[PDB]
Design a protein around this ligand. Structure first.
Ligand SMILES: Nc1ncnc2c1ncn2[C@@H]1O[C@H](CO)[C@@H](O)[C@H]1O
Ligand SMILES: Nc1ncnc2c1ncn2[C@@H]1O[C@H](CO)[C@@H](O)[C@H]1O
Ligand SMILES: Nc1ncnc2c1ncn2[C@@H]1O[C@H](CO)[C@@H](O)[C@H]1O
Ligand SMILES: Nc1ncnc2c1ncn2[C@@H]1O[C@H](CO)[C@@H](O)[C@H]1O
Ligand SMILES: Nc1ncnc2c1ncn2[C@@H]1O[C@H](CO)[C@@H](O)[C@H]1O
Ligand SMILES: Nc1ncnc2c1ncn2[C@@H]1O[C@H](CO)[C@@H](O)[C@H]1O
Lengths: 227, 232, 241, 229, 238, 238
């Protein structure tokens, strides 16, 4: 929908963002990704400091975009990318707290599914519980890539919380259910992708137990998904 | 584990059920699968007519077991299989109604995730919404096997309903969300397997259309062949 | 209303329209259903073997009735009961089953008449009910069942039962039901009651206590199961019309 | 527990209230009941105008008491009566709106079950849906009494609403489910009676259709009075 | 809407109720307020014993009306008043238990917001959580009057419970959230006022402490110590 | 708690943030606020580009900080500020869409309460419905400032949504309940402040009318027509 670009949150015109977007929470990290991996970089967004860049990675056009923190924030960005900019694929990368005791610091978690605190699923009027899943194909390509590069990974359920600071201790039930790791965004992305018939995947590096070399390895898995 | 066998629902003693169980709702279908694909068949269960057989498929030990209809029913059998009988993987095959308009009668759906009506999940005291997912490895192998056999398949989200007959029309929101198909069991299986740290996957054949003409079937062997290729 | 010949046979029932009588007794276990038909019915015809959910139609003291397996859990009984009331013209369904005792005055073999059924989620959402729906039995069946147990001199209680969606619980979610005076736990009644209410038809669940959910947790042997469900079946059979 | 009587809502000392209580929402109707049917009447409560009287009906000691409107109101009174005053049976009588289209003004509805909006349940920590039911024996006796007098009645499900005025129209699903009539109190009474192991029943006269007034209420009162032991 | 008066719960004809209504739960207390503070008193209601009177307070027509106990009861009366009788302003007065440990017996609590157990928000078809609030202007005038007269008060969140008798102990989480006091009515009044675009406020005198040793007002203090709250409420008469 | 600063979201050490913090979603707006109104400005945070500055307004030390978009984002910042940095009051300022049809572009809305979609009430284990309210004293001060300066304002309920794009139309019931305006942050701030026993207020400038013909502020108006709100907000610094 070219008529809806630029948006209140994104200064890009239609066509300035690639069909594959890598997203991360921190704009400083998004900039480091652009500087490290992309050639011919142009910035298409600086609205609200949520920097977005478009460049080339091994000859294919690729965009990297900041999404801020929490499901409502990434929801706004992903909705616009999928529905207004013609984006096909969003891969979110970031750090996470491990719930699963067998995960080591720097292990890659591939988020096949995302559990969640209520966000904006109510706005879809779903008469039961909706299970947020990644796109099977991105998930399969991310696993094949980790296996090809011989990196340590686990694929399974993550948890997209609305809180960073817990007023209680609410982690026990998720741990008992086999959830691998906690972050704050994936479930919103998966829902929006599913509604749009587009592909999303969240990949995470474990950084806390509930770095540059480890994180770089997560990047090589993610970047291998660029199309 | 062994001390809990036999159970109120399963006459098998510990060890009489293989590490891989293939499950279907209908005991007549389970019997067929046993008669068609397994050799040296022993029936380990007849409790409540929920038949269970152990035999060899291509010389590899395998069990096949009826689970009845609905999440509470499959919950009982899968909880017992995973927690008392030492079962490592359950592959469920079944029929489903299509929500996605590109699915035709006889297409196969691989349930990567399962949406659900509230069942027994309250028992887990979960402070949010739990997303039910299949075992990824099973998922991938099922896709590869379907591809190699040349079957029409889709992999994605399915919906485990508590009803076969809808008092209204509640399929709309699920359809908007991209959910592929409706059955009555998968979410319970997936939850129980995740808690047990075991593997589960649900595969389905579209037997009725929940859109358009609503055409229904009066042709399940292709799905059995994908399922059988997962046995270990 | 209640009769739709063109929807018979269904995906779950091989019966043609008219092969099922106006009163159906239902139990979870197809072996109990067969036993009941073998013990009590004459002129018996099997009208269903679909999914092993055996169903028979026969006569008891000159009255035609059907007996049918319904499998385990609310979604399962919900399928069969919906079809029976909406497609097969059934007027009355009496569920007979086994149950775990919550009320400590109940002994093994005691009969519980489910005037009401508490429940974990079943069909309520699909009916779009904007509050809490209380699942109750048909008063007339309830009253007949109590009168029969009373005339036959059986130990019974009439009150609330609980239709659970689980058999296993890693913890203990039973305390609050006991406090509320719930008598017994099973897994089906509430869905039956809701489906019958929707259809304006009659339903009742009766139970025999086969396990105690208190104390040392005594349970019936297989022999006691075979022989101590007689009293309930007989009460149930006298409700057929 | 005599130690808890009188209460903040009830001036009665332990023993001033009989083992059977008839309850209605309206204190004026409660006074009329005592004046009409009871002999040797003593008023045991006037706190908040929620009048309570004790007297004899055909030689049997009986109490009648106002409960006001809504589940939180009846819950306070019923809780005190069952847990503090040694009350064994409460029969509530009142008016209701019809949901079932075959009900005429003045029909009697016997509430075997009561559907509800939230009132009391959450405070009991119940991990599922609690079905609120009447005492079977009382329900049976009411049905026999109505049948014997040959009154038009139905016995089945009622709905205890938290509202008299509906902002939209939320009656449709209740009607589809066969719920007979709407009032505002029964389910709380039923829940509190079940928790206490005591007996309760709600009976109603249809006064409005949600789809001679005094004389209509009298038939119900006569059925109610039949149940007093 | 004159055509809806009298109602099943209120014998008044349209115009017999003033634009400002003071409400309390207890009819005995409503009668006392009328006799004490109003001149030219006419009783407009005695239906269900929920007495209502109209008179003058310092030259301004004012009505006082009983509302019974609980959100459904006050909901009926408030709905009628705002939607049929042309009422602009309802101030509820009453007693409450303290959750906040710095409140003493006799302190005034002004309910800027009301937490609640579900009573009848479902009937409004709200697709999230609705926060029940008082009218700011009334709230501001109550706080000013309390300060000007030097009364001990706190202004903040109250809790409208569905129960007087707790089967368990559910007070902990409210206390953690800073909720000041528990009563049984305010949230429904506030929701109905907001829907009608009218003004409502609940003020409370602490009559029991729901913390520590559970101190209660004596029967004598209950009879006596609601006068301060009255002068605050009466400041709001318009 | 000096030991918990800096945090993973904030590079400030304890004491680098004043006891009053004005927060807005957009770091470019926060920067503009610091440059236009504050003297002796020091930047204490650039973590995640969520800039924060501390400086002086009319002799009074204050901070201004970006909070990003949505309740979980503001929840992170506000939790840290109240619990680690010793902050006493946080005033959120922002733009909002009007639900109330008497509101014009540029009207100021003071959020006495905030309705909400789920944020982290679940995390507080509350056994009913919690009404999110502002601090009464900030609320009174804001209204007083707006009156003395003569600005057009309304005080009442706002709605903190979890969505900006509505997959349908869920606005009807909020409008019906008399909610004034929609934004995405206030309820979480209010809840956290209540738990912490600290003060919070959200004030909004109407930038879009979610009714009628749908008038929206010009890009020039969005850039420049927020000064009236900012002046009210600044007068709350102590
Ligand atoms: N333990 C954790 N809990 C919640 N979010 C986390 C955690 N660790 C990393 N994150 C991620 O970092 C950001 C919050 O610091 C969020 O946007 C989230 O994706
Ligand atoms: N449209 C449908 N809705 C629900 N379950 C279905 C449907 N079609 C097939 N099934 C499957 O068939 C069985 C019931 O006929 C169930 O156990 C369920 O798994
Ligand atoms: N203690 C119990 N808990 C749950 N279901 C029971 C129990 N006892 C008997 N049942 C009945 O038996 C089956 C499960 O064993 C169910 O269909 C249920 O109706
Ligand atoms: N249509 C109705 N809706 C709710 N309550 C009703 C209705 N008709 C009569 N009542 C009864 O009368 C009182 C409301 O006037 C309530 O106490 C309730 O028990
Ligand atoms: N602790 C309390 N809990 C509930 N209601 C109370 C409490 N203290 C006083 N009240 C008030 O007293 C009445 C019940 O006696 C209610 O209408 C309510 O407004
Ligand atoms: N109509 C609106 N809906 C949601 N958020 C809005 C609206 N207008 C302004 N906002 C604010 O602006 C941001 C969305 O761009 C949110 O952070 C929110 O606070």
């Amino acid at each position: 929908m070219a008529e809806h670009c630029p948006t209140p949150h994104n200064g890009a015109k239609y066509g300035e963002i690639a069909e594959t977007v890598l997203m991360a929470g921190d704009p400083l990290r998004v900039k480091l990704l652009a500087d490290t991996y992309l050639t011919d970089v142009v910035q298409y967004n600086s609205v609200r400091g949520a920097v977005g860049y478009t460049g080339y990675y091994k000859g294919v056009k690729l965009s990297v975009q900041a999404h801020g923190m929490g499901m409502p924030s990434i929801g706004i960005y992903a909705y616009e990318l999928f529905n207004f900019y013609g984006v096909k694929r969003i891969i979110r990368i970031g750090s996470a707290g491990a719930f699963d005791e067998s995960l080591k610091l720097g292990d890659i978690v591939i988020g096949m599914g995302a559990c969640y605190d209520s966000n904006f699923e109510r706005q879809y009027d779903i008469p039961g519980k909706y299970s947020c899943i990644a796109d099977f194909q991105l998930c399969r390509e991310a696993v094949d890539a980790a296996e090809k590069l011989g990196y340590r990974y686990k694929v399974g359920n993550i948890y997209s919380a609305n809180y960073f600071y817990d007023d209680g201790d609410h982690s026990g039930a998720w741990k008992k259910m086999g959830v691998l790791a906690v972050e704050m965004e994936a479930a919103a992305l998966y829902m929006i992708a599913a509604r749009a018939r587009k592909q999303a995947l969240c990949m995470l590096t474990i950084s806390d137990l509930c770095r540059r070399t480890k994180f770089t390895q997560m990047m090589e898995v993610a970047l291998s998904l660029a199309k």
